[PDB]
Structure 1
Amino acid sequence: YTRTQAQHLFIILMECMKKKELITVFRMGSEGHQDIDLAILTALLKGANASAPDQLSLALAWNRVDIARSQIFIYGQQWPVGSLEQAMLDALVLDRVDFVKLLIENGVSMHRFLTISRLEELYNTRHGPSNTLYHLVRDVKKGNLPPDYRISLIDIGLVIE
């Protein structure tokens, strides 16, 4: 394949196999990773060398609940204090029902999570589909609404009434 045995790329090959921690091999009909999409996505979590909250954030951004179920939520992951709460908040803003269900199943309690400030933040988000809440708030206030107005829970009570 090359210029006989006189020319070889074995030095480069042995350097690559010395750094074989990142190399992933997909073998058809083999032990693990029979799917290409699973082989690619699982390599991005191990190869990132980040913490569990960062892996959960990546899986939440990719909207892949099976990757987080089979890799991130495993035996003894040692989540930092206050990480699952922020993960639940991010999944709640981005309209990720599967991730909310998975996080509720995997430890978080909605009674301690939901506070007045968190609900206020949830009512003033931008990540999500279109909604007519701002028009209703403007209509209840009879106009004269300053730009970049934070919607308080009192206005939400008024619009509910």
Structure 2
Amino acid sequence: QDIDLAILTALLKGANASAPDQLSLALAWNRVDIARSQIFIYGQQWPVGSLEQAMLDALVLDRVDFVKLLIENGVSMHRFLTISRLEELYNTRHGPSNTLY
């Protein structure tokens, strides 16, 4: 009942790629509406480390609803956050402006 659903779903299945390629499309579109119901589905096989890498991209692009969505799917913040990954978070350039420098 919606061409908005119809375009974006057809891009996900039309690519027909694995789950981390599909999630990175929805992240670039800032659309958790399609990532909740199709990309994060029952039985959807997630490669080892794809959820942790997509978590790093979601923080540096300031997408607060994706960080909620991946955590509800796991990505324990206790096991994701290392020294090297946190240093990459302070040295990102994507996202909103900062007075850090």
The TM-score with structure 1 as length reference comes to 0.62
Deviations 1:102-123 (A, max 9, x none): 0000111000000000010000
Structure 1 counterpart SS, 2:15: coil
Structure 1 counterpart SS, 2:86: helix
* Residue of structure 1 equivalent to 2:6: 39
C-alpha displacement at 1:54, in angstroms?
0.4
Deviations 1:93-150 (A, max 9, x none): 100000000000011100000000001000001101111000xxxxxxxxxxxxxxxx
Q: Determine the C-alpha separation between the residues in 2 that align with 1:78 and 1:36.
A: 27
Structure 2 counterpart SS, 1:39: helix
Higher helix share: 2
* Residue of structure 2 equivalent to 1:109: 76
* Residue of structure 1 equivalent to 2:99: 132
Structure 1: gaps spanning 5 or more residues: 1-33, 135-161
The TM-score with structure 2 as length reference comes to 0.98
Percent identity of equivalent pairs: 100
Deviations 1:65-89 (A, max 9, x none): 0100010111111111011000111
Aligned residues: 101
Structure 2: gaps spanning 5 or more residues: none
Greater RCO (Cα-Cα under 8 Å, separation 6 or more): 2
Q: Determine the C-alpha separation between the residues in 2 that align with 1:70 and 1:84.
A: 16
Bigger Rg over Cα: 1
